[PDB]
Design a binder for this molecule. Structure first.
Ligand SMILES: CCCCCCCCCCCCCCCCCC(=O)OC[C@H](CO[C@@H]1O[C@H](CO[C@H]2O[C@H](CO)[C@H](O)[C@H](O)[C@H]2O)[C@H](O)[C@H](O)[C@H]1O)OC(=O)CCCCCCCCCCCCCCCCC
Ligand code: CLA
Ligand code: CLA
Ligand code: CLA
Ligand SMILES: CC(C)=CCC/C(C)=C/CC/C(C)=C/CC/C(C)=C/CC/C(C)=C/CC/C(C)=C/CC/C(C)=C/CC/C(C)=C/CC/C(C)=C/CC1=CC(=O)C(C)=C(C)C1=O
Ligand SMILES: CCCCCCCCCCCCCCCCCC(=O)OC[C@H](CO[C@@H]1O[C@H](CO)[C@H](O)[C@H](O)[C@H]1O)OC(=O)CCCCCCCCCCCCCCCCC
Ligand SMILES: CCCCCCCCCCCCCCCC(=O)OC[C@H](CO[C@@H]1O[C@H](CS(=O)(=O)O)[C@@H](O)[C@H](O)[C@H]1O)OC(=O)CCCCCCCCCCCCCCC
Ligand SMILES: CCCCCCCCCCCCCCCC(=O)OC[C@H](COP(=O)(O)OC[C@@H](O)CO)OC(=O)CCCCCCCCCCCCCCC
Ligand SMILES: CC1=C(/C=C/C(C)=C/C=C/C(C)=C/C=C/C=C(C)/C=C/C=C(C)/C=C/C2=C(C)CCCC2(C)C)C(C)(C)CCC1
Ligand SMILES: CC1=C(/C=C/C(C)=C/C=C/C(C)=C/C=C/C=C(C)/C=C/C=C(C)/C=C/C2=C(C)CCCC2(C)C)C(C)(C)CCC1
Ligand SMILES: CCCCCCCCCCCCO[C@@H]1O[C@H](CO)[C@@H](O[C@H]2O[C@H](CO)[C@@H](O)[C@H](O)[C@H]2O)[C@H](O)[C@H]1O
Ligand SMILES: CCCCCCCS[C@@H]1O[C@H](CO)[C@@H](O)[C@H](O)[C@H]1O
Ligand SMILES: CCCCCCCS[C@@H]1O[C@H](CO)[C@@H](O)[C@H](O)[C@H]1O
Ligand code: OEX
Ligand SMILES: [Cl-]
Ligand SMILES: [Cl-]
Ligand SMILES: [Mg+2]
Lengths: 30, 504, 38, 172, 38, 81, 34, 33, 34, 342, 36, 64
């Protein structure tokens, strides 16, 4: 149960990395 | 839009919805007290006020009800051990119910004040703008605080019209709720004199009545009004937070060191009673008095109350717990069942030896026995190959006086070493470790948890005071500095007085 | 009297050498007398 | 070790075997990271204190800066004017370039020394040893705080890897 | 009764009052002599 | 600028060095003599190398009472013969 | 042109005067024998 | 291993309640004009 | 105690020597601020 | 109204080399006395009667081993006023009883208050936002929690940190052996804040210096900057593209960047302060109960957690007798925990 | 009877990512102590 | 804005927004009470601390 919890949290973070890099708000110059 | 950390600023200029928000907070806090008390009542075991008092059971709000005179249940028990009592309506259950009902009434009021926010009372009569006259509000509220403070001391604590408060003897053996008369001399400022508590509330209450009337009738000086921004409600938040963290540090300290308002029968012993062998000295004095009066060793020790021996045990020291060791103390060493009696160790020469007690600093401690003069006579060795003081070499035995093992002596090394391991914790008890599946690891008491939460909250509220004080005094630059700031105001020399353009 | 007479670089050099003298004395004392383990 | 408690094990045993706390390169390393965190909050607070008002109070001040804008977003003169008076004028930077260079260099140089401490204690050139350095007139040892550190180090030494030594000197 | 420590308390009070008093005395004095030009 | 005389001005003026070629060594020598006369030991109550212990004792004169600590130190000092 | 006794003068000397006295005291200590 | 079994729901609400808060605020920001 | 006078004497002679070299300007600075 | 208060206000706020202000009435004496007490104590004052230690240059200690040590455990939490009932006005006894320690700690606490009031005071005169004062709340939380709350939870000031280099190292090691402080998640957060702060300091400084605009002709680029210029001196656009392509993400808001630089170390120090408040009560993160149950029953179960506890046990038993002399610990050689051979 | 003090609330996408990362990392740190 | 019976009763109690006393007003009397209060806190602090010891004031549980 606790192993599943640790790995699940870890996996969510790696997923978050993906969206933060590739699905970020684009920086736009003005 | 508003960032997430600012959503509640919409109430700053809306006194009626501010009152609604404050009513909803009060409803939540009252409902917490009612529901916490119900949870404690569903888990509290009232059947042994000697070896299983409330502070061994993780009770947090029960001791605060008992402190001011609520001691009984509608089901017929009291926390001092009486049966067949009738507490009237103000039992633990009646107090919890009263707070639940109050919670619901305040919830309804909050809805009324949220919908009917635009009340003429909140408008300045000259300008029609929302406005609160904070200096006069302060005097009204301080006046009400003074009256309430005074009536608490004069009527509740004295027993004139009320139950009094919890008072005990210096060893926490005979506590009960008693009317308390004020102490008007210098001992009234002794933290351990309950009489000073009564005198404080009568005297500070009167002072608050007077100061309230003053603050209703005398307007603030123009110089203080400008300097403290008394038209800005956020100056009240800043100074209120400062008073609150001041108060929180004080209640954390008196909980840790002890005082007349944090009795040991409600919150458990203090760590300092173990540091100074406070209970061990009273126990010894009583045994001396018996031996001196001709009783035997077995009679002297058997006359020691189990409740007094239980205080002389490091498992009840609130400095022995851990941050993530959760639950009641009973979950650690177990539910105490009986004093085993006082262990006396002797070597082969018949000399009495004394186990060195564990200081609170140490998670573990070696087993070391000295004579009356502190000379090492026996120990439990780590490396056996050059041991000279083993129990086996020194013929160490243990005999018990009083308690359930009264009159017995053990001579086999394994059993003697077993009791010597327990003796570093002070007096030795039998524990039920099965009922709660206790794990054998010490936990802290409500005294420990109260102190930790309130010191942490006090420190955090210091940051709140700094933050809201800064917002009050620097409201004009909250969004940034003036875009037309002259370099001359910040370069050296141009003004004789820093920031004063009239001193060019 | 009037600031300017003694060049700054000579001031800097003389004050530097005094620092080195006094710090060297402290390191000498680590090996002699008190605190030297002897 | 590649773990959190394994890291702590490494540090504790390192202290027993090299007295890293008494090594000046670890001390320079501490100055590096304590200094770096200090100057981090320092730089952040000064620049934040002198943001030019571009927003109303109901919005984040961060919207007052636009990515790629030509003009600076804070008044470094006002920041220098504050910090110069906090200490004295010549203890404060007014050149953003040499300020940011100092921010770069201080933690980097300190961490270089920290890395060189580990690397040179790798070859057993250990921290200062003042064990029994203070002696009285008769020759009694007078303990200093260095000797109390030694007692702690000995407890670490005698317990680490409790089954791995057969001979009295832990030479590696 | 004036215990030794109550005596010591009064000495502490007087000392601090003296220190604060002279401090503000000198300060008020100097501020009156060296005024700013407006 | 804040009006005071520049430091570089002052410390390169002959008058500065006339004054401080005296005041600095005088203070240094006062500090040396504070130690060499042994006055520092007596002001601060610090043991000399021969007064940490009595000749045959090896126990620290540790203070163990709060309100009689002054008398305890005085007693430890007598026992130095 | 400039004053001599300023606040800065006082601040400088409350630090510098004891520093020199202490350095002489610590210099003497290097010759103490046990 | 004899872990505290409340650890599971404690961790799960610790993640879920504040994460859900943030998602609500974000989604209603996108849906504004 | 004579050591108190042995220690203060180098400091006292330093106080008077700097007063000799500075008193013309000191009186002149106090006069201007009046 | 131009009374004496306003004239005093004028003089206190003059633009001089060292600004004074109203805050300076508190700041300057208290800072000066705390610094002077530390230098006086480390040069001349012993710890023989309180700790059994030499601790001054006079006694032969060096810059690493001098300290102003805490008072004897028998003083409890006494204020140890010079005129109080322990020293009774005797300056020499006061020094020998540890009075300089509360002297430094208390004048230091009020000095720190004064420095933060100075940050507020100057900020209000110059017209800047007071975020420098807000950021300084983190050093104050650390000082108060370590030097005041922590010993106040313990038996006496004796267990506070002593003011010295090696004395503070002993404080670190005591916290490992007795409190298992490396295991504490509030310390972990503090470590993250301090190392993350040092990281941010280095990376921002280097990024600026390596995205500079060529605004001059010299090979030394420092000269090509003017405090009053309106333009950014470095390229935020190029900096953003570099980190986006090296690391994946980058800053794009310069106001967020510098706020974050305040936030990270300040929050870290505050978190570490909270954990030390817990240690005041011995409310430690010492153990994982699940690990201890398994390990008690299964003598083949070993982790780095159980290895480190054995080190803590060595620290406690080997340092306690000398480090806590008032306890009179006598631990015969045979009870001392030791591995094989060592 | 519309209250004039109401204000829209915002949370931008970067703040969402930052907030989720803080919460997941805090959970990853504290979970071991919850299980104990 | 909405008038109510209770609001009309309380109206005078919220009608002097911004009214000050000229100048320094009662500030010097305030300062006297603040100083007296500071000495009071010092006394009760030092009693609890056993830095101030008074006859018949025994700061201990043994005072019941
Ligand atoms: C934020 C920004 C702040 C900016 C900095 C501010 C700087 C201000 C400086 C203030 C210094 C405060 C000094 C407090 C000294 C103290 O506490 O001294 C302690 C004394 C109590 O004294 C102790 O009491 C203990 C318990 O004894 C009691 O029990 C004994 C054994 O059973 C005996 O019976 C004995 O007679 C009886 O008195 C032991 O005797 C100790 O040895 C003895 O030192 O309390 C007292 O003076 C007063 C206690 C009540 C008020 C406490 C509030 C302040 C501290 C809050 C911190 C919380 C700490 C809890 C831990 C977390
Ligand atoms: C002042 C507040 C306070 C205090 C001192 C107590 C004290 C107690 N409670 Mg009570 N309780 C409280 C409020 C409090 N309670 C509230 C508000 C609730 C409703 C939730 C409860 C509901 C409750 C229940 C249901 C129970 C108790 C029990 C107890 C007892 C055991 C406590 C324990 O194991 O904690 C363990 C404490 C911890 C593990 C500390 C948690 C530390 C947190 C997680 C740190 C979080 C860090 C944060 C994420 C970091 C942010 C960083 C960011 C800002 C950057 C103890 C007597 C137990 C008992 O014995 O009853 C008989 C029990 O069963 N309490
Ligand atoms: C009497 C207490 C009190 C009151 C009536 C206020 C009111 C306010 N604060 Mg202040 N503040 C306080 C105490 C208080 N604060 C304390 C102790 C601190 C230090 C921690 C602060 C630090 C602080 C900062 C840094 C800021 C404020 C801000 C504000 C304003 C907007 C708050 C908001 O929208 O939050 C919205 C919050 C949320 C939507 C979620 C927060 C969830 C928290 C972090 C965890 C959950 C807590 C839990 C539910 C309850 C535990 C209760 C605890 C006391 C036991 C509002 C005027 C803001 C401001 O000035 O705007 C201009 C602002 O930036 N406050
Ligand atoms: C100006 C800032 C300042 C501040 C905030 C402090 C603060 C402190 N000092 Mg420090 N000190 C200072 C300057 C300061 N000092 C200076 C300039 C010197 C050199 C002389 C010292 C030398 C010094 C020594 C030698 C000692 C201290 C000590 C202390 C501590 C106890 C103070 C106390 O109890 O006084 C109480 C006094 C007051 C609060 C004065 C207030 C007076 C009230 C408001 C007016 C009413 C009084 C009335 C007129 C008199 C009635 C008396 C009558 C009944 C007999 C406290 C931390 C003690 C310490 O550190 O303990 C370890 C200590 O031993 N200080
Ligand atoms: C009886 C008595 C005494 C009564 C007193 C009453 C009274 C009124 C007294 C007043 C008279 C008086 C003045 C007496 C003085 C007494 C006296 C000498 C007191 C002294 C106290 C004392 C020595 C305190 C010491 C304090 C101390 C150690 C300060 C150290 C300062 C120091 C080391 C600074 C170096 C650090 C530094 C340069 C950091 C810069 C790095 C950094 C990242 C900057 C960031 C940054 C900088 C910028 O620059 C700008 C631009 C921006 C963008 C930016 O990011
Ligand atoms: C709405 C949101 C609700 C969920 C939000 C997220 C919850 C996260 C969990 C946080 C608490 C985790 C508790 C530990 C794990 C657990 O299960 O404990 C479980 C324990 C309960 O304890 C249980 O009791 C039982 C008998 O009653 C048994 O003995 C069990 O063995 C025992 O575990 O939970 C508590 O009692 C804690 C209650 C609250 C106590 C707070 C005291 C200290 C507060 C100060 C903290 C301030 C810090 C601020 C820092 C900034
Ligand atoms: C141990 C406990 C003791 C308790 C406290 C007792 C001491 C009080 C503490 C504060 C003392 C501060 C003194 C420093 C002030 C000073 O030196 O001003 C020096 C002034 C002004 O100098 C002037 O210098 C001025 C600039 S400035 O203010 O110095 O920056 C300049 O404007 C002017 O032309 C020039 O004449 O000259 C004086 O004669 C001061 C008279 C003192 C009476
Ligand atoms: C010269 C000796 C330097 C040795 C150590 C290196 C320090 C500088 C490197 C830090 C890297 C930070 C990241 C890059 C940050 C970055 O990009 O830097 C940029 C910065 C400015 O670059 P410029 O192009 O303007 O100048 C460099 C060349 O182009 C020559 O003009 O470089 C320098 O200032 C170099 C300074 C040389 C002189 C420095 C001497 C420092 C010695 C101080 C004594 C230390 C002793 C401490 C004992 C405790
Ligand atoms: C409506 C109504 C009613 C009812 C009412 C009710 C039924 C109520 C209830 C109420 C309630 C039932 C309430 C409750 C509340 C609770 C709360 C409010 C809680 C909170 C909590 C918290 C806040 C916590 C926190 C924490 C955690 C979680 C963890 C640890 C740490 C801390 C502590 C932070 C009646 C009939 C009377 C009448 C009228 C109407
Ligand atoms: C405590 C007390 C007090 C006070 C006192 C004081 C205030 C003092 C001061 C003092 C001082 C104020 C001292 C000082 C000293 C100083 C010193 C001793 C220094 C040294 C230095 C050095 C040695 C240096 C080194 C170096 C470095 C660091 C780096 C760079 C390079 C070099 C190497 C140079 C009173 C009487 C009030 C009261 C009683 C108590
Ligand atoms: C179990 C955990 C759950 C935690 C609970 C979280 C509750 C959070 C509630 C957030 C509510 C936000 O409240 C929401 O604010 C928005 C703007 O922000 C308001 O929206 C308003 O402004 C927008 C913006 O132009 C207009 O287009 C719109 O027509 C108007 O209604 C919504 O009317 C309201 O629904
Ligand atoms: C060898 C086992 C029997 C010898 C006596 C052991 C000490 S006593 C023993 O200690 C247990 C906790 O360790 C308690 O749970 C139990 O109640 C108690 O009887
Ligand atoms: C504490 C200080 C409170 C200021 S008090 C104030 O000071 C004025 C000077 O401007 C005097 O003119 C006035 O009479 C006095 O009451
Ligand atoms: O392996 Mn890991 O640790 Ca470096 O010493 Mn030798 O070895 Mn072991 O002992 Mn100590
Ligand atoms: Cl190991
Ligand atoms: Cl080997
Ligand atoms: Mg030497």
């Amino acid at each position: 149960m606790e192993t599943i919890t640790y790995v699940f949290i870890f996996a969510c973070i790696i997923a978050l990395f993906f969206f933060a890099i590739f699905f970020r708000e684009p920086p736009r110059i003005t | 839009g508003l960032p997430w950390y600012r959503v509640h600023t919409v109430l700053i200029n809306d006194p009626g919805r501010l009152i609604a928000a404050h009513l909803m907070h009060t409803a939540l806090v009252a409902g917490w007290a009612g529901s916490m008390a119900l949870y404690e009542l569903a888990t509290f075991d009232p059947s042994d006020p000697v070896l299983n008092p409330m502070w061994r059971q993780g009770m947090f709000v029960l001791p605060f009800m008992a402190r001011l005179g609520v001691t009984g249940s509608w089901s017929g028990w009291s926390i001092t051990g009486e049966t067949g009592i009738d507490p009237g309506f103000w039992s633990f259950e009646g107090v919890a119910l009263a707070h639940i009902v109050l919670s619901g009434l305040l919830f309804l009021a909050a809805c009324w004040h949220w919908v009917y926010w635009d009340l003429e009372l909140f408008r300045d009569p000259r300008t029609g703008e929302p406005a609160l006259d904070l200096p006069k509000m302060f005097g009204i509220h301080l006046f009400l605080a003074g009256l309430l403070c005074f009536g608490f001391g004069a009527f509740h604590l004295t027993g004139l019209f009320g139950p009094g408060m919890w008072v005990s003897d210096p060893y926490g053996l005979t506590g009960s709720v008693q009317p308390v008369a004020p102490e008007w001399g210098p001992d009234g400022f002794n933290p351990y004199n309950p009489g000073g508590v009564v005198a404080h509330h009568i005297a500070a209450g009167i002072v608050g009545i007077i100061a309230g009337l003053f603050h209703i009738l005398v307007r603030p000086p123009q110089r203080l009004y400008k300097a403290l921004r008394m038209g800005n409600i956020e100056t009240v938040l800043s100074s209120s937070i400062a008073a609150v963290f001041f108060a929180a540090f004080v209640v954390a300290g008196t909980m840790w060191y002890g005082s007349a308002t944090t009795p040991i029968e409600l919150f458990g012993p203090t760590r300092y009673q173990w540091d100074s062998s406070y209970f061990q000295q009273e126990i010894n004095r009583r045994v001396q008095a018996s031996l001196a009066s001709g009783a035997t060793l077995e009679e002297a020790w058997s006359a020691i109350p189990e409740k007094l021996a239980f205080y002389d045990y490091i498992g009840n020291n609130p400095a022995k717990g851990g941050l993530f060791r959760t639950g009641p103390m009973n979950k650690g060493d177990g539910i105490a069942q009986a004093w085993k009696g006082h262990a006396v160790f002797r070597n082969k020469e018949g000399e009495e030896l004394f186990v060195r007690r564990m200081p609170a600093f140490f998670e573990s401690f070696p087993v070391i026995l000295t004579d009356k003069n502190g000379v090492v006579k026996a120990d439990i060795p780590f490396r056996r190959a050059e041991s000279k003081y083993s129990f086996e070499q020194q013929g160490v035995t243990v005999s018990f006086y009083g308690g359930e093992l009264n009159g017995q002596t053990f001579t086999d090394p394994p059993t003697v070493k077993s009791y010597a391991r327990k003796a570093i914790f002070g007096e030795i008890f039998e524990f039920d470790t099965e009922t709660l599946n206790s794990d054998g690891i010490f936990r802290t008491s409500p005294r420990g948890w109260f102190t930790f939460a309130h010191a942490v909250f006090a420190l955090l509220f210091f940051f709140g005071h700094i933050w809201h004080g800064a917002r009050t005094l620097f409201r004009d630059v909250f969004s940034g500095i003036d875009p037309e700031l002259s370099p001359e105001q910040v370069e050296w020399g141009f003004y004789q007085k820093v920031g004063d353009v009239t001193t060019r | 009297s009037e600031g300017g007479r003694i060049p700054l670089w000579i001031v800097a050099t003389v004050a530097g050498m005094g620092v080195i003298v006094i710090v060297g004395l402290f390191f000498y004392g680590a090996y002699a007398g008190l605190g030297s383990s002897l | 070790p590649l773990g959190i408690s394994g890291t702590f094990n490494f540090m504790i045993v390192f202290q027993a075997e090299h007295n890293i706390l008494m090594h000046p390169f670890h001390q320079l390393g501490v100055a590096g990271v304590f200094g770096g965190a200090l100057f981090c909050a320092m730089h952040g607070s000064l620049v934040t204190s002198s943001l030019i008002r571009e927003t109303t109070e109901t919005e984040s001040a961060n919207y007052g800066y636009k990515f790629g804008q030509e003009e600076e977003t804070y008044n470094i003169v006002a920041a220098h004017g504050y910090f110069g008076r906090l200490i004295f004028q010549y203890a404060s930077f007014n050149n953003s370039r040499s300020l940011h260079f100092f921010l770069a260099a201080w933690p980097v140089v300190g961490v270089w020394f920290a890395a060189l401490g580990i690397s040179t204690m790798a070859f057993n050139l250990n921290g200062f040893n003042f064990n029994h350095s203070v002696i009285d007139a008769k020759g009694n040892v007078i303990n200093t705080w260095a000797d109390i550190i030694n007692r702690a180090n000995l407890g670490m030494e005698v317990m680490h890897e409790r089954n791995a030594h057969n001979f009295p000197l832990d030479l590696a | 009764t004036i215990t030794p420590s109550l005596k010591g308390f009064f000495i502490g009070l007087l000392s601090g009052a003296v220190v604060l008093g002279l401090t503000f005395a000198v300060l008020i004095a100097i501020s009156q002599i060296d005024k700013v030009q407006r | 600028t804040t009006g005071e005389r520049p430091f570089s001005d002052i410390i390169t003026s002959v008058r500065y060095w006339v004054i401080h070629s005296i005041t600095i060594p005088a203070l240094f020598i006062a500090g040396w003599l504070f130690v060499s006369t042994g006055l520092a030991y007596d002001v601060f109550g610090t043991p000399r190398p021969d007064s940490y212990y009595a000749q045959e004792q090896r126990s620290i004169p540790l203070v163990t009472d709060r309100f009689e600590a002054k008398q305890q130190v005085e007693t430890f000092l007598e026992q130095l013969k | 042109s400039y004053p001599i006794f300023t606040v800065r003068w006082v601040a400088v000397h409350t630090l510098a005067v004891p520093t020199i006295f202490f350095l002489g005291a610590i210099a003497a200590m290097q010759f103490i024998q046990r | 291993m004899e872990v505290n079994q409340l650890g599971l729901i404690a961790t799960a609400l610790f993640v879920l309640v504040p994460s859900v808060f943030l998602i609500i605020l974000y989604v209603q920001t996108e849906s504004q004009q | 105690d004579w050591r108190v006078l042995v220690v203060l004497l180098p400091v006292l002679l330093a106080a008077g020597w700097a007063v000799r070299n500075i008193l013309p300007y000191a009186v002149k600075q106090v006069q201007k601020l009046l | 109204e131009r009374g004496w208060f306003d004239i005093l206000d004028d003089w206190l706020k003059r633009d001089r080399f060292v600004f004074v202000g109203w805050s300076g009435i508190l700041l300057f004496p208290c800072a000066y006395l705390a610094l002077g007490g530390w230098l006086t104590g480390t040069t001349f004052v012993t710890s023989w009667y309180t700790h059994g230690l030499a601790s001054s240059y006079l006694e032969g200690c060096n810059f690493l081993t001098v300290a102003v040590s805490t008072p004897a455990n028998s003083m409890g939490h006494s204020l140890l006023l010079l005129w109080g009932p322990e020293a009774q006005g005797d300056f020499t006894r006061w020094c020998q009883l540890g009075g300089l320690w509360t002297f430094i700690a208390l004048h230091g606490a009020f000095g720190l208050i004064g420095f933060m009031l100075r940050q507020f005071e100057i900020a209000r005169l110059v017209g800047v936002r007071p975020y420098n004062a807000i950021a300084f709340s983190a050093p104050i939380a650390v000082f108060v929690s370590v030097f005041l709350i922590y010993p106040l939870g313990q038996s006496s000031w004796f267990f506070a940190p002593s003011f010295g280099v090696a004395a503070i190292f002993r404080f670190l090691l005591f916290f490992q052996g007795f409190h298992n402080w490396t295991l504490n998640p509030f310390h972990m957060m503090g470590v993250a804040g301090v190392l993350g702060g040092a990281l941010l300091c280095a990376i921002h400084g280097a990024t600026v210096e390596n995205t500079l605009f060529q605004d001059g002709e010299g090979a030394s680029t420092f000269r090509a900057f003017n405090p009053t210029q309106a333009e950014e001196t470095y390229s935020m656009v190029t900096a953003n593209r570099f980190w986006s392509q090296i690391f994946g993400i980058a800053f794009s808001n310069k106001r967020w960047l510098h706020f974050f630089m305040l936030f990270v170390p300040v929050t870290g120090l505050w978190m570490s302060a909270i954990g030390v408040v817990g240690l005041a009560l011995n409310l430690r993160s010492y153990d994982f109960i699940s690990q201890e149950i398994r390990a008690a029953e299964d003598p083949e179960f070993e982790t780095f957690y159980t290895k480190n506890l054995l080190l803590n046990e060595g620290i406690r038993a080997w340092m306690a007798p000398q480090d806590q002399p008032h306890e009179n610990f006598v631990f015969p050689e045979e009870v001392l925990p030791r591995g094989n051979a060592l | 009877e519309p209250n004039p003090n109401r204000q829209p609330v915002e949370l931008n996408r970067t703040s969402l990512y930052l907030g989720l990362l803080l919460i997941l990392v805090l959970a990853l740190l504290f979970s071991s102590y919850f299980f104990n | 804005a909405r008038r109510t019976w209770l609001g009309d009763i309380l109206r005078p109690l919220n009608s002097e927004y911004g009214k000050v006393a000229p100048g320094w007003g009662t500030t010097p009397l305030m300062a006297v009470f603040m100083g007296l209060f500071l000495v009071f806190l010092l006394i009760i602090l030092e009693i609890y601390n056993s830095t101030l010891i008074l006859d018949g004031v025994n700061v201990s549980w043994k005072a019941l």
